[PDB]
Write a protein that binds this ligand. Sequence first.
Ligand code: ATP
Ligand code: ATP
Ligand code: ADP
Ligand code: MG
Ligand code: MG
Ligand code: MG
Lengths: 492, 137, 109, 132, 89, 467, 468
Amino acid sequence: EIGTVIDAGDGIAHVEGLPSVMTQELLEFPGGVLGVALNLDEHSVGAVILGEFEKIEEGQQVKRTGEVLSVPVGDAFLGRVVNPLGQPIDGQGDIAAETRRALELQAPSVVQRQSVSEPLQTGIKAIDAMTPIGRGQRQLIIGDRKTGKTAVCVDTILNQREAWLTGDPKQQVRCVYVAIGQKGTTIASVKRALEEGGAMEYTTIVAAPASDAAGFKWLAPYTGSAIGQHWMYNGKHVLIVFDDLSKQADAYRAISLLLRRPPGREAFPGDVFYLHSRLLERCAKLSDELGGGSMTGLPIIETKANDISAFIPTNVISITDGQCFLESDLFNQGVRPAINVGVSVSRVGGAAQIKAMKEVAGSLRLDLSQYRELEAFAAFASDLDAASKAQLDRGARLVELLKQPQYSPLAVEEQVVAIFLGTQGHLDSVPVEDVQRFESELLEHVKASHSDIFDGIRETKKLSEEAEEKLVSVINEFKKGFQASDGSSVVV
Amino acid sequence: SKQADAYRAISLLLRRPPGREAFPGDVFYLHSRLLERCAKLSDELGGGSMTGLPIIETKANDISAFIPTNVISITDGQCFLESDLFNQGVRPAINVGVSVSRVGGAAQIKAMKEVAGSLRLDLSQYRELEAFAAFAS
Amino acid sequence: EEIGTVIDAGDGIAHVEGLPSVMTQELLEFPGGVLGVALNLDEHSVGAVILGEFEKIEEGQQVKRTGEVLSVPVGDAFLGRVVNPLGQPIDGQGDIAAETRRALELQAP
Amino acid sequence: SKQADAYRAISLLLRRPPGREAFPGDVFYLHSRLLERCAKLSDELGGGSMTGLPIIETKANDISAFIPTNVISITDGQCFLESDLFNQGVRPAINVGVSVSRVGGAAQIKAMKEVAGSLRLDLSQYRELEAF
Amino acid sequence: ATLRELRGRIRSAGSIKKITKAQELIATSRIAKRGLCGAYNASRRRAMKSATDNADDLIKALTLAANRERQAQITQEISEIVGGANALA
Amino acid sequence: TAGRVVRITGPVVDVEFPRGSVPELFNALHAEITFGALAKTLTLEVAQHLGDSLVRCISMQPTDGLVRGVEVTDTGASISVPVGDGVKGHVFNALGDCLDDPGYGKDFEHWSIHRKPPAFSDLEPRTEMLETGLKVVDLLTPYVRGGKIALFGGAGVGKTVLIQEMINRIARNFGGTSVFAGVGERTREGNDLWVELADANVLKDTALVFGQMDEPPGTRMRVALSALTMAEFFRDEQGQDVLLFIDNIFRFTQAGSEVSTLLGRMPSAVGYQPTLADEMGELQERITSTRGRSITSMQAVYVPADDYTDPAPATTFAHLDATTELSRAVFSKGIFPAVDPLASSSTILDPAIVGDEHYRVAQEVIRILQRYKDLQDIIAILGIDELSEEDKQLVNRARRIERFLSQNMMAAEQFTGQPGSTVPLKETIEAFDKLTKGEFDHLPEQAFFLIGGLDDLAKKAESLGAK
Amino acid sequence: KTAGRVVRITGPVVDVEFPRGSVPELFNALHAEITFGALAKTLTLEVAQHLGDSLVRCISMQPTDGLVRGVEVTDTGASISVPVGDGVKGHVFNALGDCLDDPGYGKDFEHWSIHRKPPAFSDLEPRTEMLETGLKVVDLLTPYVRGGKIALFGGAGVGKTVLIQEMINRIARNFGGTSVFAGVGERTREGNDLWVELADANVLKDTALVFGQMDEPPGTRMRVALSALTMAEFFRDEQGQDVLLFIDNIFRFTQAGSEVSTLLGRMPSAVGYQPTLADEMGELQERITSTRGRSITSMQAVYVPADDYTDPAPATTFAHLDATTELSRAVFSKGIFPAVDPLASSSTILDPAIVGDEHYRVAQEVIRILQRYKDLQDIIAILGIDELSEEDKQLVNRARRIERFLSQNMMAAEQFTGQPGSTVPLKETIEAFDKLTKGEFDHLPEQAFFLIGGLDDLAKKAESLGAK
Ligand SMILES: Nc1ncnc2c1ncn2[C@@H]1O[C@H](COP(=O)(O)OP(=O)(O)OP(=O)(O)O)[C@@H](O)[C@H]1O
Ligand SMILES: Nc1ncnc2c1ncn2[C@@H]1O[C@H](COP(=O)(O)OP(=O)(O)OP(=O)(O)O)[C@@H](O)[C@H]1O
Ligand SMILES: Nc1ncnc2c1ncn2[C@@H]1O[C@H](COP(=O)(O)OP(=O)(O)O)[C@@H](O)[C@H]1O
Ligand SMILES: [Mg+2]
Ligand SMILES: [Mg+2]
Ligand SMILES: [Mg+2]
């Protein structure tokens, strides 16, 4: 069966014939071009061209592969950059594919899963303590441009370095980074950041730069999802980042409009929500009978003018297992990461944290939300009561504590100790302006003199009573020698 | 409002050209035709009458929407009910400042007209003076 | 001569069948001294935007070519005169001795 | 502004999908190709020139609307008359802060330049000073 | 969302306006007979008159923005509706 | 006498039949996908009669792999689901297939998912209060036994946590059957609910029907009808009290709007299907209690973009007896449950049913909160000190009241690490009456945050040092 | 035979029917003749779509006025090509490659197609070398990248073109490589002024000008950028030069694309823009990149419609830029030049790993102070600075002084004020802003910081105002 291109243009084609073509089938156009059949009617077949559509012409012969969209999958994809078809684009040679995997495969059923119970440490105090991410969770990194979303995702990928070095498949996390509509040099810089941190040893990049046709930008998240799913169904743990899904939505809208499907809100196709939802429901925590593997999703959404009420941001927020709002106003204030505490949450909750972090950070998010509310309320108070003053001081110290620079991941034990400092009142004596330094210094002290606390937390996942008392004693002893910038003693 | 929504559904399913808020071009005609049958007949026709009390449900107290605008234009007077007054304890929560009856005193008995003459002035003046309740001195 | 026929007309627009040699942006005469500009040309008909009294345009009317591409008269005679966008005097002071005709869509320097 | 409204009417009657404020996508092309023909010809072409004085009606002094911004991006400066000054009695009601002449500095006799060069920004700042 | 935020800001500014006007009148009465004084520390009647005028200006600007957003929302809604209808035409 | 596929555009399939064999509307048709990696049996619901013996249908399963001109078999009846006590304790999809035990229930009685609502004569209003144990719900939004309850709110404000809390507080001790309908929600949430019900031994009395958000629009539209059919069988045949939980009902409307344009319908306002209110009315009027037969329905309603003026929640509002609107502002202030006391309502919150004291206390609380909301902006700009002494007292009272309306819920233990608490109605009324009288103005407002009753208030106050 | 004929003419878009088997390839250049005396010319059409039944839809590069149905259309066999080589330097070309200042020039040069694929991913290298312009605001808060992509956003009349001229004066003058300036949908008189100014400054001999201005059909307005990019790409790839590429204005390319899409019958996306907006922008931008070992330092002005930064065009353009400088109407109103929005503007190399710890610290302190000032502005508009706390009053004074000091007297601004511009070294900028943040200059009047250079000019103007 050979069809004939009856028309072409703008990355779309209409082909007559091929009566036995399947929906979403992969068609071959002359010159090695590939298309995907989306619209099927008696008149013709509508196809989206996946690349170099300038070579398509009326009357060309089109063959049907007989296979729906699928991509190669295997461990050989680690450390490689590929296009949404799995073809390498880093110029390093062929990739040995273990097997093939269709892009449209149903997500694990409600009975094939188990509750998310394993932490996925991002190394970032704010996320790990306030909006924890478990393995099998979908956490949305949403915010304006230049708010640090890619920074958060790249730091999360880098923080898996130690887990990868452990060598235990139950601990290792394999990373897939899908870049959609990104400038090529930005993808190159991301790859450089992963390589300098030795993260490409266990990372695959699916790249659909803005130069690519809308088909590649629409498919790239599904290609990455299939590549991650191959590992997930083999007992591995996968973390997948989509940067961004709004670019996917734009590309899909372009494809749908060119195919002349009736649009809806903001000219988007009626099934854009279905697109994103069925993409993101494949990130799951499989049951023990299926190997116990998981895929953790980190979709990234860019909001224009902090408008989270737009169509795609609203859909993606409603889809994921929690969101991590980043605000430019918070970013400029020095709150880095600029996570808006009141609106950011994780629906997995404490189940995604270790016991020690759960105990230290039990009510941190609520405490900070209430602190922000009180700070807004008491903006122009002429004489505050004692309880309000204490709450404001504690909240300011906590806000200072949650600040963190870029490319500076913290081990789970160090984060536990820092949050213990913050929430147990040991920072009340320290001036706000010094809190950060104090925190860091104390960690180093515990690293060089009382490392047994870190080892105990890391091996037992719990802060024992004896360990807690020793930590308090060490905190006070360090306070004795600590030098505050203002000169005030931080003892008692 | 629900009748207008149902008629809009019917019209759209009939592929009639939509306008503002997807309503057809004769939704105002729908409501005006409905509400102009409430009349006060002359004595030659028996002197009967029918009084209309249409209800409109606004969203976010938006009286400038399409159907509310049409119905406000059609009717002879409006009673605006506000949830803010309702929560304040004012119940029925009729906003006397903006509610109006173009028929006016012609629809009141003499005693009611006499007693209620000063009520409007007093309420308007009270609304003006509201801000000074803290400084009675 | 070439003559077309109005195949439909409404709200300031008309469609004329025929006129195979009509240019783009050409001026067409509809009966009663009405004028139109041919914006859309296709194998079926020509879409003309009417300029003036559109209410005098009827289906079946005979439409004639002018041979000019949306031009207007130009010359020193226009000083002290009031004209409509077609260059026709509306002050009621008689004809205007136009030096020549200039097309409206000539490129800028 | 009324030409833009008429062209929008024509385009909508042609069932051309509109954009911002229901205007077509080529309304900017309309105004820009109109105003690019007001030029100062070179001496080779005779040295003649045409000076354009397009008028635009804003709504509530909103110079950030679509057509006003288009024309501002087309023309060589604007003389923004604001209703506030006009009603106060200052006529002509030129808004000193907004009004500007991009290519007007050269086209000015020596004395006028020497006298008004300061005056311009002096009034521009004295608006702010009088704000207090 | 922008329209709702603009309406909220308009009501906020209105409440500010009434409270400032009441303070101005009370200050006038007290003159005839806290920090809301304008620049005494760096008078309260002058400061409250200025605050009420600024609130009036802010309310007018917010109302203009809200009306612009209302018109834009109506136009965009009609654009989507007519685009769908044309697609189905 | 079988048809064949003619057009395929996503979840909408056109099928041509021989003359005289055109299936009736809503009939279930079967088509086969034979592709190795995606072999399956598509179930198509006849949605439109296009003429010329063509019918437009919605696919319940994904259409990837479908081929034009393939055999389509007409079953002669609408989508049917198993009914009977056997459904209790199992998980089903929109088509009635059992998930926890494939092939189970194939022999039970099968009821068509499309049904008419009860006759107006049979309908009879319900006014009995349903005591939950949450201060805010019990006081300001009393729930009706056998009535319709909704939990409105945007994304991530606490609708699902509140649904789980109500399952814990109502279903656990329920003496009748329960039906949960997970309409277009997260699969992880479905698994969590299944495991939770199994742990609490309440699954044996509960029937679960799940249609997830990764399924085509057809499943999301018809899963609610399937669950409602099971609930209707329990109400009408078994004649026992039924608990019906739906989460999220808005997904039904959203799926309806997804296929609207693909079905040839012109879009209504806000890109909604023109038949939004009609479909909503059919589905919601099928959810009701009849004379002598009680269904207590609790529905989580998603409010798109926190916009309560959106046509979907606005249309939904008319179908409810009690509504709890969760607010993004309350949520961001850290108040949980994030109920907006001023926007909530209950048809039984009048003196005739709840009593004079309850009504008086609720109205005073509402008035104080409204006044505090009015003074919010003045406080934000000019500061509190510029308010009158009465206004300052009211502001403090309102802050304490809004903190006290918060509570530590049992279903929220995994989020705060704090065990939940339950407050009897009389204690709630007494405590809020004391609050509105200024009896606790001396205690810090922080003492009123995420506690239970007055004993917990005293414990927290003495922990903070107050008394 | 093999030549098609016109069947439909709807504005710049023309449908051409060809004999079976002779249908031209997409983007091929066809030629048609308009013979009417006034409008006589040779239309160059670009094949845009294949409509089927041997029909092709093409975009006209010249106005189609006077074109007649059924006239002969001849296929050139190749897409639009433009001259390349050192010869192009010092001459003015249009979108089609025709030399305007010397007609017939370049017909003998090598000709390159204006449609090309972007460089392969393996050939891309991130760039992080700072470009010292000499402006305080740019150097401090959004340093430019050498070999990177810089954009200037802003509404109508905020200083996009003046800033482009400033950067041409500060970068192109002392440049050992080649420059290409692409005027895209801009004022023709602005193009003439740029031509004259580059001739006077002696920079023209090293610069190639390509002008498709406002009074051109949308096809030309959307293809002139591709022509100039082709010239720049030849200079980058073949001659191994460091190429400067100035584009003014890219939003005009997007808007012309929108007009063409409307004329092509495509269904419109949000705000009436073309469905392929992001894809066309991606192609054009990704062609502008710098490859490994070969540097193109591009600088594009982006018009923001109705001052709406949420508009789809700039919204999509944002992602293609290493450095972004957003010009604000609010800043412009205050008379601050350049009218840069320090909070909105950004740069990818403003991190301590590239610009050093001191520069990053000073920039972040300035940004924090300005953000706090912006947050306070809402109370301030109502109640002056009088109700703020002492810390807030001090911060507001510091922020006002900082925002005045971010303004500068620019070289290109002399024609508007007669004041010669000033250049501030990066070290002096960092020192001065560190002092400002530390509060050392809080005693000077605000006007002392308005439109000056470094610390010496600050002292001179403070003396002129009777201050320390
Ligand atoms: N925690 C942090 N501390 C300091 N700087 C940070 C931090 N996170 C990000 N940045 C900086 O903020 C800028 C934006 O970072 P990033 O690229 O991650 O943001 P984004 O939101 O993904 O941006 P875009 O819209 O360009 O994709 C970069 O300069 C990055 O170095
Ligand atoms: N640094 C400056 N000093 C003084 N005046 C300036 C300065 N920059 C701009 N202007 C004034 O602003 C006017 C507009 O500047 P410019 O043409 O560069 O803006 P633009 O953003 O390119 O505008 P448009 O959208 O109209 O093309 C200039 O003509 C001049 O009047
Ligand atoms: N009682 C509570 N205490 C603390 N957090 C809560 C409570 N209820 C809800 N939340 C938070 O609200 C978020 C959304 O919860 P959920 O109800 O599952 O989503 P939705 O409200 O969209 O249905 C969760 O991440 C959870 O942390
Ligand atoms: Mg990013
Ligand atoms: Mg939920
Ligand atoms: Mg300019």
